[PDB]
Every structure is written in C-alpha cells, then in structure tokens.
Scaffold this active site. Structure first.
Site, short mmCIF file in Angstrom:
data_model
loop_
_atom_site.label_atom_id
_atom_site.label_comp_id
_atom_site.label_asym_id
_atom_site.label_seq_id
_atom_site.Cartn_x
_atom_site.Cartn_y
_atom_site.Cartn_z
N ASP A 1 0.81 -1.24 0.00
CA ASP A 1 0.00 0.00 0.00
C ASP A 1 0.83 1.27 0.00
OD1 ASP A 1 -2.17 -1.80 0.22
OD2 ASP A 1 -2.65 -1.25 2.27
N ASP B 1 -4.92 -0.74 -1.38
CA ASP B 1 -6.21 -0.57 -0.71
C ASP B 1 -7.07 0.08 -1.78
OD1 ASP B 1 -7.09 -1.38 1.95
OD2 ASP B 1 -7.46 0.70 2.52
N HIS C 1 -11.01 0.97 -2.08
CA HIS C 1 -12.34 0.98 -1.45
C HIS C 1 -13.40 1.71 -2.28
CE1 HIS C 1 -10.66 -0.68 2.19
NE2 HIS C 1 -9.98 0.41 2.49
N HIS D 1 -17.61 2.70 1.87
CA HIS D 1 -17.06 1.49 2.47
C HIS D 1 -17.37 1.35 3.96
CE1 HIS D 1 -13.65 -1.39 3.42
NE2 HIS D 1 -14.18 -1.95 2.35
N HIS E 1 -10.70 6.88 2.68
CA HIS E 1 -9.35 6.74 2.13
C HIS E 1 -9.32 5.72 0.99
CE1 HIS E 1 -9.57 3.28 4.84
NE2 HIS E 1 -8.62 2.74 4.10
N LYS F 1 -7.32 -4.68 -2.84
CA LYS F 1 -7.93 -5.30 -1.67
C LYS F 1 -8.94 -4.39 -0.99
CE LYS F 1 -4.26 -4.07 1.56
NZ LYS F 1 -5.04 -3.89 2.79
N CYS G 1 -1.87 -3.62 7.34
CA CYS G 1 -1.61 -4.38 6.13
C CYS G 1 -0.38 -5.28 6.22
CB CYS G 1 -1.47 -3.48 4.93
SG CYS G 1 -1.17 -4.43 3.44
O1 NIO Z 1 -2.65 -0.63 6.68
C1 NIO Z 1 -3.62 -0.76 5.89
O2 NIO Z 1 -3.67 -1.58 4.94
C2 NIO Z 1 -4.85 0.13 6.10
C3 NIO Z 1 -4.95 0.92 7.24
C4 NIO Z 1 -6.09 1.71 7.40
C5 NIO Z 1 -7.08 1.67 6.42
N1 NIO Z 1 -6.95 0.90 5.33
C6 NIO Z 1 -5.88 0.14 5.16
ZN ZN Z 2 -8.61 0.51 4.20
#
Ligand code: NIO
Ligand code: ZN
Ligand code: NIO
Ligand code: CL
Ligand code: ZN
Lengths: 200, 199
Positions: free
Chosen positions: B17, B58, B60, B64, B77, B102, B146
């Site tokens: 990420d 990430d 979304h 979400h 985010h 993801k 993550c």
């Molecule tokens: O670390 C991640 O993958 C993360 C953390 C907050 C929100 N979405 C993903």
């Molecule tokens: Zn997330």
C-alpha cells in the site's frame, strides 16, 4: 435476444487486454484502429455484470526490449516501463478490477499471453484464477490477433472455458481475422457478442 | 553481519500500500515517515533479483464499511479511481510484475493482501504458489495493519516471511511492541534491508 449467458459471481472471470495509451491513443506507437471505441462497451461490462474476478493486463517492455525494430524485432518501441504510453488509458474504469498483470517484462523475450512470460515461466495468472474457483473466462480488449488471441488460447491450454467478447476487441491487422478466428473456434473457444450477457 | 541472499526462483517481494493517501501531503490517512521509505523500497525493488514483485492497493468503494462515515475506524481513504488511491508517483513500478487490489467490496474489509475479512481470497496465495515462491519479503505500510496481517497470512499459506523492518512505517507507534511479539513467534524474520544480497 437469441441466447442468454448468465454471468456467475462464483465462477466467471473477465480479462481486459492491453487497454493502454500506446495501443489506443491517436498519438502513440502502436495505434490499434477502433481501439478507443471499445472503452464504452468494456466499461459497461466490467461495470454492470458480477464476475467473480476481473484482471486487466499490461504490455510492459524495458527501454531496450527484443521486440523493437531498434533491436531487430517486429514492432516500434511501445509500452516502455513507466512511460506514459504504457499506462492504462484514462477512459478505462479500473474500479471493478481486482488485479493488473504485466507481461513482456524481460529484455530477451516477448509475451503475447497473459499466462506465460520469459519462456516456460508463468505469470501466476493461471494459478491465481484456479486458486479462486474460476471455471470460465471472458476476454475483451486488444490486440485481437495478438494478446487476446494468445491469452484466450493459453486459457484453454490451462483448462478454462473461454468466451471471447467478439464486439469488444480490435486487431493490428484485419487480414488476420480469418486465420485467427478459425484457430480460436477449432481450439474450442466460443465467440460471443457481449449483448448476450446477463447477471444472476 | 548475518546476510540473506535473494533467489530469482523462490524469493518474492511484496510492497504494501504505497499509495497517495497514506504517504502524500493532504492524503486523508497519513502514515508518519511513510514517504521517507521510498528511497529504500526503490533500491530493494531495482537492485535485487526477486522472482516476482507485487504492489498491493487498498481499493475501497466510496461508501465502504470501514469508513468513519459508515461506522468504521478510518477517514474515507483510497477510494476506487481517485487521486488518493493511486500508488505514489515516486515508487518505481518498473520491476513489479503484478498489482493486487484489496478491500474491494462495500460490506467487507481486508488489511491482509491474502484474504478479505469474510474469507474471500484475493488470489495472491495461488499466484505466489503458481510461480514457485517459497519465501516472501514484506515492506511498506502499514506495519500495524496491512503489513502485519499479510505477514501472518503468508505464514498460514506456508511461505517463509522476512519483514524489512526499516522499510515500514506504522499508523500507530505504540502498537509496534505488540505486533513484533506476535510476528516473532509467528515464525517471521525481522531484518534490515541492508542484509539482503544478490546471487
Ligand atoms: O494498513 C492498511 O492496509 C490500512 C490501514 C487503514 C485503512 N486501510 C488500510
Ligand atoms: Zn482501508
Ligand atoms: O497485443 C499484444 O499482445 C501486443 C501487440 C504488439 C506489441 N506488443 C503486444
Ligand atoms: Cl450459461
Ligand atoms: Zn509488446
């Protein structure tokens, strides 16, 4: 219509082939005629039908790849890594795409398939798909006589049912359409207009 | 002075990420010191002969379940197809063989790059097994989400895991102590990237 094909959220996958700036934009090395027109239709299929998984592919060559005329190959340089032309086109909607898979990554060998790469060596696509239950794969994008052709054919080679979305594809050379179509059909790929698809 | 030689047949790198929201100024969910990682991951990515390298994302939908607006922990985010969701321009994608998205449906989250929170697989495991990965190197953000869960899931799928401790930042520094303990006896190896050498 004439026939109905149900898209299943457990079992059907979609591959979106080389929808990149270099193949699709007017300026750009390897323009495929009628390239951008497909966007409209592909965007809708990815959008409105519930595939188990969606994969877009990316031709991704180094600065000095073997397939370039500057190094003895058939093509003009195209889809150089991190070059603008190598990017997916802005008109494509990547929001329902679970994975991007890259090919033609090594200086010494080219790849038209989304499944193999540096010769024997896999991209792990066959693996991942099987791994996630996928049983039948749909293919659209470019180039019909190349990426689409070999990707669909390697999918059969790997045990998947293959359905080629006929109207959502375009070729480098239209004289190859006869030859390629036959090869597809005889290898048990079924060609199909997208308007025959419905969700569960 | 204890090294780890990286194989072009078995070793796979996962960059976790490295996206605009976690990293850039005005990003909605900022990992402190996340931008500063870019130098080292680019070095590891380009100077080492990994079989395969995977960037996760990430990814979304705008409504979400994990967003605070819908009763989850986090600000909106990495919305699908937004400036924020993009991989940071400063990451060199040249040697990345695959990008995996993801947290892709509204009703389920996924800190792991292996499985969504509801058991649905991302396909990562099968991909890595397919190409013959026997151990995975993990770097990026976030150490406490993550990166942690990917490491653990890689361990459930039967991969060896080396975690590049110097190429990670956490959303929350205090948590660091609890995660490393869990990772320690998860069988994971913690290692500075300057311990990796080629063939
Ligand atoms: O670390 C991640 O993958 C993360 C953390 C907050 C929100 N979405 C993903
Ligand atoms: Zn997330
Ligand atoms: O569509 C393809 O696979 C293709 C065509 C020409 C050059 N590179 C890739
Ligand atoms: Cl059917
Ligand atoms: Zn090419």
């Amino acid at each position: 219509p004439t026939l109905c094909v149900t898209v299943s959220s457990t079992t059907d996958v979609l591959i979106i082939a080389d929808m990149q700036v270099d193949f699709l934009a007017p300026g750009g090395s390897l323009h495929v005629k009628g390239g951008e027109a497909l966007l409209d239709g592909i965007n809708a299929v990815s959008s409105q039908l519930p595939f188990r998984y969606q994969v877009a592919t990316q031709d991704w060559h180094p600065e000095n790849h073997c397939s370039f005329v500057t190094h003895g190959g058939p093509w003009p340089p195209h889809c150089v890594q991190g070059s603008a032309g190598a990017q997916l086109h802005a008109g494509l909607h990547t929001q329902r795409i679970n994975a991007v898979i890259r090919k033609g990554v090594t200086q010494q060998a080219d790849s038209y398939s989304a499944f193999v790469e540096d010769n024997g060596v896999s991209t792990g696509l066959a693996g991942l798909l099987h791994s996630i239950g996928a049983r039948r794969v749909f293919v659209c994008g470019v180039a019909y006589d190349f990426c689409v052709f070999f990707t669909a054919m390697d999918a059969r080679k790997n045990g998947f049912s293959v359905v080629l979305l006929e109207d959502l594809t375009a070729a480098v050379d239209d004289a190859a359409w006869s030859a390629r179509t036959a090869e597809l059909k005889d290898a048990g790929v079924v060609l199909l207009k997208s308007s025959a698809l419905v969700a569960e």
